Design a protein around this ligand. Structure first.
Ligand SMILES: Nc1nc2c(ncn2[C@@H]2O[C@H](COP(=O)(O)OP(=O)(O)OP(=O)(O)O)[C@@H](O)[C@H]2O)c(=O)[nH]1
Ligand SMILES: CN[C@@H]1CCc2c(ccc(O)c2O)[C@H]1O
Ligand SMILES: [Mg+2]
Lengths: 334, 335, 55, 282
């Protein structure tokens, strides 16, 4: 009686609720999710900004980065004009409050007028500083904790690309969650073969990237997820190879026995030297990929410049292949 | 600086010597004459469906009739065990969720995850809405528990545990001392003390009012993923990633007993006790659950009704049913 | 920064000077608790189907 | 001796068909993991094969062993009609499976949205309705009955009944039942093979320097079905167009050869590791 009335409302609500989940189920299966793993100072956040192109508070922040850059270079000097400004920079070296005043800003340009920037390997600083000392939104670097998610729509499909950020992340345990992702977009730095990591001796920054790649490649949970590889910072590699300093063979002795691949599509107008290096970096990366996988893993290398090159089509083109190979293997047609 | 290291070695050996002087006999010898419990077999009573993705959390209610579950679909659904009826489907701003709670008063439900932010909702207002957003923290959260309508305790992966304040949205006090990610916690029956299992293979006994640690147990050998409490309030069981579970004692400050088996090479995701603290149910990563004995280390039943790994487990406050969630987006009720 | 080391050596001192009891007493207390409360354990002793809410 | 012994040999075949399709039907429904969009067609095929084995095989064996049919004229007309239904519906399911696989392989992005449970149910119901329309309606209405002295004598006589058909019905039934799906399946599998070859070439180009599976799978899938069914439908037109070249012995032998495709189907299809695990569990 009254109880019968009590049952009736709940059944309708279950009926109403269950209708709503049916509508949302179709949207969930129509979205392909990508995880933007990488390494520190690799330009991964530049890609996200270029992806928000599909679909003034920071200006105050840019100055703070500039202040950090001046302090690091001045401290690096210890390793006479405006000596008082140099003392003033030491005086203003650690003011936790804001540092609004013009005289330090004027003094800073004068102090630069030196060779410390040339010895990049000896200390640790920010890459963005050279542009700041002498797109603008993406140039600045900010460290923030949290997941940045960007949803963009192309050719009647939906892609949800998100980057996870850890300032001191190590022995990652949240990687177990990402089991159903379509692909992992791995970003590396190709101009870090002659730089140290964190100012701790560490190793060549790349050697850290390769060690990170090995851990990602061989994992129980990530045993069925393909990897898309981006070799960022192509512009800086060409300049360093042209420059006499920072010889590649010294830091990596295995380059001496390496030879150019039989197969190549060297870009137009490229000296047989810049190019030679490029392949080595790639192969070094693939060597790990071919060792294991047993047909459930694949690596798609690429050569990109984050600032200028457009890369929206490359991800879409390769993503159609990843799904196709999975369906071929399941049906044993492959 | 090196002089202070000398005191550490002397102090550390003092505790070990003192502990070894209090171990009169093993626990097994004392309870050797106790008759075995026998064989325990239970079967699925209800199956709960509706989730689009895997599940990481579950928590029963005080009335032992309602429960809440969380998933990666962005949903926080509240079921009803008796009639298998959904009552609320709460959308989430962030699709990544790693924990959920249920206040004793039955009015508030909490959630959190990789967003570094704990969220609080209001069931009984009739539209579900966000009430507060506790955001001052760093690292992914692991667990949340409710003391009363105004207090909540959270732990995360930044080697800290804090006690919040819903009304003001600020940390009343903070706990520090761990060197690794904190993964689990739960409160004592009187809501005065709580522990935390970290990734440095150690457990600590905090104090809510005092704000300082009291004891430290380092009997494990790998990361810790779950931890529970005896109903008496003087013991707690820890399940680590080394395919083992251990039982400690607060008053004795020692490890009393160890549960392990040679045929199991998988980690533990969740553990729990019974109403009388006799059966120590523990989840496992090999697609099923095992029922242990809290004082005999004898398996007395296996629950293998799942097609994937188990990520949560709980027991009703009336001790009438056991709920197990898994990664196949299905809940189950055993009795 | 050795001060961080200094904080560590103070905590051990507090945890060292606490009272302990024998393992046998704790085991006996657990035995008494389990023996007293084993009666009201529905999982241990199954309840009749006429009084089982889920059946 | 041999006549009595041969009947025992056919008894073993009937047992395998009934049990083989029963295992697939029960295992698919019992386990929730085995349920999928593509398994509804497999379930329909298993049901059709089980109905064939339970209905037409034992009665056909009894008719072969004992010279005169005993149930009656109406009942053997019903037997012929249900035989036509079970034969027709089994073939068209394989075409649907091939089309679904082609949709999955060639167009991956829109496959999830294009196919749904309601759409699959509608397609299966339409296929079964089309199969029923061609089988029951003409056979039960005596439209297919031919006018010939031997034919009219057999039709009037209630002692036994044998298959005698009209030219138009024979041609239409053969075409609709076999020829239309065959070319469709051939084109589908050719396109699938071309796509697989292109993908293998891409893989070889990408990381080759440091295709037996497709050929074997396609060979099994196509050749088994073709060798099982093609000769019967290539002699079906032949014995009607021309003047009594074939005897009833070769006709019934080819029909019985075509029958065992239902028994072979459970082994050919659903060979995934999940099916093996489910069978081992139960
Ligand atoms: N020459 C060159 N420099 C680049 C390119 N892409 C990025 N960079 C540099 O790298 C910066 C990108 O920011 P990063 O310092 O890598 O920091 P982030 O992108 O936040 O990445 P994380 O440090 O890993 O969080 C740009 O401001 C440039 O200084 C490129 O294609 N060429
Ligand atoms: C003798 N039994 C029947 C006769 C003719 C026939 C069969 C099957 C499919 C067809 O399309 C047919 O026309 C045989 O099973
Ligand atoms: Mg970052």
């Amino acid at each position: 009686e009254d109880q019968r009335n009590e049952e009736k409302a709940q059944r309708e609500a279950n009926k109403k609720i269950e209708k709503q989940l049916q509508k949302d189920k179709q949207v969930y299966r129509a979205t392909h999710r990508l995880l933007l793993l990488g390494a520190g100072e690799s330009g991964k956040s530049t890609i996200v900004k270029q992806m928000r192109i599909l679909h003034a508070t920071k200006v105050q922040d840019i100055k703070n980065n500039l202040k950090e850059a001046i302090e690091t270079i001045v401290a690096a000097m210890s390793n006479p004009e405006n000596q008082f400004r140099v003392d003033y920079i030491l005086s203003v070296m650690n003011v936790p409050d804001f540092d609004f005043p013009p005289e330090f800003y004027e003094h800073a340009k004068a102090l630069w007028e030196r060779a410390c920037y040339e010895r990049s390997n000896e200390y640790q600083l920010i890459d963005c500083a050279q542009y700041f000392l002498d797109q603008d939104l993406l140039r600045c670097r900010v460290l923030t904790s949290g997941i940045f998610e960007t949803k963009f729509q192309v050719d009647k499909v939906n892609f949800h690309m998100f980057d996870v950020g850890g300032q001191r992340d190590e022995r990652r345990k949240w990687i177990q969650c990402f089991n159903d992702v379509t692909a992992i977009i791995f970003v590396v730095a190709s101009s870090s073969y002659n730089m140290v990591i964190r100012e701790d001796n560490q190793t060549n920054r790349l050697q850290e990237a390769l060690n990170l790649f090995k851990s990602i490649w061989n994992n129980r949970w990530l045993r069925t997820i393909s990897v898309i590889l981006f070799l960022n910072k192509q512009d800086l590699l060409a300049e360093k190879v042209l420059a006499g300093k920072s010889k590649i063979e010294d830091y990596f002795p295995e380059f001496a026995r390496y030879t150019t691949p039989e197969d190549a599509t060297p870009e137009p107008g490229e000296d047989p030297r810049v190019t030679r290096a490029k392949y080595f970096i790639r192969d070094e990366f693939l060597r790990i990929s071919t060792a294991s996988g047993d047909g459930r893993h694949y690596c798609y290398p690429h050569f990109t410049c984050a600032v200028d090159t457009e890369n929206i089509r490359r991800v879409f083109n390769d993503c159609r292949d990843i799904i196709q190979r999975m369906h071929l293997r399941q049906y044993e047609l492959l | 600086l090196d002089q202070l290291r000398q005191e550490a070695e002397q102090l550390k050996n003092q505790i070990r010597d003192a502990r070894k002087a209090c171990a009169d006999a093993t626990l097994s010898q004392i309870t050797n004459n106790i008759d075995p419990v026998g064989r325990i077999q239970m079967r699925t009573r209800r199956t709960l469906r509706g989730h689009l993705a895997k599940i990481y959390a579950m928590h029963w209610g005080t009335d032992s009739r309602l429960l809440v579950s969380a998933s990666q679909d962005g949903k926080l659904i509240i079921w009803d065990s008796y009639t298998t009826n959904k009552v609320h489907a709460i959308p989430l701003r962030s699709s990544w969720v790693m924990t959920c709670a249920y206040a004793p008063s039955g009015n508030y439900v909490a959630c959190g995850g990789l967003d570094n932010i704990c969220s609080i909702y209001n069931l009984k207002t009739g539209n579900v809405r966000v009430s507060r957003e506790l955001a001052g923290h760093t690292g992914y959260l692991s667990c949340c528990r409710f003391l009363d309508d105004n207090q909540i305790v959270t732990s995360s992966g930044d080697t800290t545990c804090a006690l919040w304040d819903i009304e003001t949205g600020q940390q009343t006090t903070t706990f520090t001392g761990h060197t690794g990610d904190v993964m689990s916690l739960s409160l004592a029956p009187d809501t005065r003390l709580f522990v935390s299992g970290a990734c440095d293979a150690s457990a600590k006994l905090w104090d809510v009012r005092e704000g300082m640690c009291r004891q430290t147990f380092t009997g494990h050998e790998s990361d810790i993923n779950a931890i529970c409490f005896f109903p008496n309030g003087n013991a707690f069981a820890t399940g680590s990633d080394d395919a083992t579970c251990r039982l400690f004692d607060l008053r004795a400050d020692q490890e009393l007993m160890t549960y392990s088996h040679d045929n199991i090479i998988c980690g533990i995701t969740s553990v729990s006790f019974s109403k009388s603290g006799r059966l120590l149910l523990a989840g496992y990563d090999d697609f099923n659950c095992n029922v242990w004995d809290a004082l005999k280390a004898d398996r007395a039943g296996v629950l293998a009704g799942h097609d994937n790994r188990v990520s949560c487990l709980g027991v009703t406050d009336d001790g009438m049913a056991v709920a197990t969630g898994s990664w196949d987006s299905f809940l189950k009720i055993w009795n | 920064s050795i001060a961080q080391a200094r904080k560590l050596v103070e905590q051990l001192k507090m945890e060292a000077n606490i009272d302990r009891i024998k393992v046998s007493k704790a085991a006996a207390d657990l035995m008494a608790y389990c023996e007293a409360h084993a009666k009201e354990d529905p999982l241990l002793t199954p309840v009749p189907a006429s009084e089982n809410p889920f059946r | 001796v041999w006549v009595v012994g041969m009947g025992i040999v056919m008894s073993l075949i009937v047992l395998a068909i009934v049990f083989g399709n029963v295992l697939v039907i029960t295992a698919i429904a019992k386990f929730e993991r085995l349920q999928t969009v593509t398994n509804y067609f497999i379930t329909s095929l298993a049901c059709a094969d089980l109905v064939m084995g339970l209905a037409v095989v034992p009665f056909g064996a009894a008719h072969i062993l004992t010279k005169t049919w005993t149930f009656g004229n109406f009942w053997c007309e019903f037997w012929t009609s249900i035989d036509v239904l079970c034969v027709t519906a089994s073939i068209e399911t394989l075409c649907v499976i091939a089309v679904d696989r082609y949709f999955a392989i060639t167009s991956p992005f829109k496959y999830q949205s294009l196919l749904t449970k309601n759409k699959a149910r509608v397609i299966i119901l339409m296929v079964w309705i089309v199969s029923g329309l061609t089988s029951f309606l003409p056979i039960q209405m005596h439209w297919y009955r031919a006018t010939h002295q031997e034919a009219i004598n057999c039709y009037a006589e209630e002692t036994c009944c044998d298959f005698f058909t009209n030219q138009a019905y024979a041609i239409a039934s053969s075409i609709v039942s076999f020829y239309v799906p065959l070319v469709i399946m051939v084109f589908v599998y050719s396109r699938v093979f071309q796509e697989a070859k292109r993908q293998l070439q891409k893989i070889d180009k990408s990381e080759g320097r440091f295709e037996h599976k497709a050929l074997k799978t396609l060979g099994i899938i196509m050749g088994t079905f073709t060798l099982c069914w093609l000769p019967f439908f290539i002699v079906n037109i032949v014995h009607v167009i021309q003047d009594n070249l074939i005897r009833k012995e070769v006709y019934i032998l080819l029909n019985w050869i075509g029958y065992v495709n239902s028994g072979f189907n459970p082994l050919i299809y659903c060979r995934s590791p999940d099916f093996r695990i489910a069978f081992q569990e139960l």
